[PDB]
Structure formats: C-alpha cells, structure tokens
Design a protein around this ligand. Sequence first.
Ligand code: CL
Lengths: 103, 104, 85, 90
Amino acid sequence: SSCKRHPLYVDFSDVGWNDWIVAPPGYHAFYCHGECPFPLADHLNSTNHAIVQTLVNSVNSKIPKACCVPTELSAISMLYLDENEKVVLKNYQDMVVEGCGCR
Amino acid sequence: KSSCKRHPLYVDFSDVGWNDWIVAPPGYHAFYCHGECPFPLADHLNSTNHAIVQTLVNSVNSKIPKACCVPTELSAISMLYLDENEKVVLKNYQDMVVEGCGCR
Amino acid sequence: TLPFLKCYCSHHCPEDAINNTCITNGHCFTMIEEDDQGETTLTSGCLGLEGSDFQCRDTPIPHQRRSIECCRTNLCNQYLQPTLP
Amino acid sequence: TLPFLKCYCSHHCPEDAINNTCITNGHCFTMIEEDDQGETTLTSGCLGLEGSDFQCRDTPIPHQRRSIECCRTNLCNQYLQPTLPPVVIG
Ligand SMILES: [Cl-]
C-alpha cells in the first residue's frame, strides 16, 4: 500500500492546548504514510536521491527505502497567548500537508 | 534508539548495474538519512511545524506515525553517459547527494 | 515541463487516475516481477521525467528478479510485455 | 533568525556538538522521561524557534510520563529540574 496522504484532524482540546490557543479549535493537518516501492511512480514526486536510494535498497537490504513525507505544505493562522498571556495573531507555516512523496 | 542523522553510503554504479550507460564517474558518495524522530525534535533536525505536531499526536495516539528521517538538503553532481544513439553527453543531476537530514 | 503523455497504470496508479490511466511528462512503464515463492505479477504506470534514466535502465541482480520497460507514446505500455532473463 | 542562544545538550546533541553544548535561535530545554522499566532519563538540548510553542507546552497526557521545561538565556537549562507528573489517576 503505497505512499499517499491520509486524514488527520488535530483537535486542540483533545491534546490539551485549548488553553493557550484561542482559535481555531483545531484543524485538518493530514499526514503521509505508505510504501515507496520500485519503480517510484510520477505521482510520488521523488528526488533523484530517493530514486537512487530505492534501487540501492533492492540490492542491499541494509539501506532503507525512501520514506513517505509531506512534499508540499501550507500555512494556517492562529490566535494564541504571548509568553506573557494575551491574544496574539500568528501565521504558522508548514502546518498542513498538501501533498506527499517519497524522499 | 538512535537519532535521525546522515549516514555514509557509497554508490557503485557497477553494483547497481549502470556500468554500461554511465561512463563517468564509477560511483559517488550519496549518503542517506536514518534514525528516530523522538519528542522533542531538537533544532538540528530542521523539523516543520507539521512534523512537530505529528510527533506530538503520535505520542498520544500510537496509530499516527512518527515523523520520518529524510534528506532536508540535497546537492548536484554531473555525469557522463552514453545516450540512446550511443552519444556521450555531460549532464548535471540535481538532488543526488544528501548534505543534510531532518524529521519531516 | 508539462504532462503530455498518457499511460495505462495497473498497480501504480495515482489516486486520481482516469480509466486506469495516468498522465506524465516522463515515460510509460510496464514491469514483470517474480516474488520469493513463485507467483509472478505485472505492473505499469507513469515514470516522472526526473530520474527516468535510472528507472528505465536494466539492473543485474535484486532479491527476486524483475524487468521493466518504458516508452513515450500515448498508451504505449499495453504493447510492452517484459520477460525475465 | 540567526542562532544567538547557547545551551547544554545531553542525549539530543547535534552530531557536531562540542563540550555538550549546542546553539539555536529558539530555547534550551531539559526534560525528564520514564521508560518502560521505570528508569528515568534526563535529556536536554536546543529547540528551534519554529514549533517551540508546541514543544515547550507538550500534551498533558502522553503514553509515557514526561516533563519538558524551556528557558531562553545562555546555558539556562543547567538550572532546570523538570519532574515527572504525579501518576495521579483512577
Ligand atoms: Cl522533505
């Protein structure tokens, strides 16, 4: 079962952050997971390295396969509390998986 | 329990069997990335916000995987190869060598 | 460079494949793979252009043997049928 | 931001740490955690600026009891002594 994006919602209340994050109450973060087989198909955006490494793996088992990771990521905004406790608006980069590939 | 880091890996173009379409070099140090991404993800693992959140979630929900140790900085090498009509072309290959690893 | 080429895909389809078809700027592939105890199985899909040369070149010795062939014409891979050396 | 902060590091040292210190643009940390045999371990190191909000805070409820503390002055993590949260529980 090959590398792809899966759902993940992170509810701030569930992980106990609800008391410094004023908003949003949570968000869709997604994650990446699954095999990086050979050959690496186009929709895995693999790097030359991930590809070389994948071939090396089939011939030397001691060398791990490419891993399935975020490959494009988007930001989100939050309202949180300063080290000194009080409403602050920050843009958090690389919070949301847009796409996954083998790297 | 050993941490995400770069490891040596030499690639002999002969072991992998390109001895005949690739004419130069015979191999190159390609390196690779391996190891745990534990909590917390220290500074030198160049983690994204995502990866850090994911590690935090994994620690409360085992069903969510840990972040993965992968190359966060790659560099180029040039090769000489014999192309379809037995031509000798010099060509620059991007993302061939791991210069740095991180949790992602 | 933009996707311009259509390929059949059978175990390596993108989630959003269309009629068991993928599009790419690289090459179509078709692969034959033996496993550890007998059963041999067939694969096909699209290879990205970057690193296409290392995937469309023929290896000498993995764990169990396999072969792979590429071509660059629409739907060209149902016409490929690779065999083990 | 350039790194401007020097910290001690214990199991989370960068592979090029010298004298068990590391540098960063975030905070220094010290954490105590428990392993499955009850053995605890002190770790310490540098946290990047990005995501330090999440890491310094933690979740109150991980699978393994732990406690992380952060501070932001040179070598400050020498003075941090995190302790396990009480197993308080029914
Ligand atoms: Cl990456």
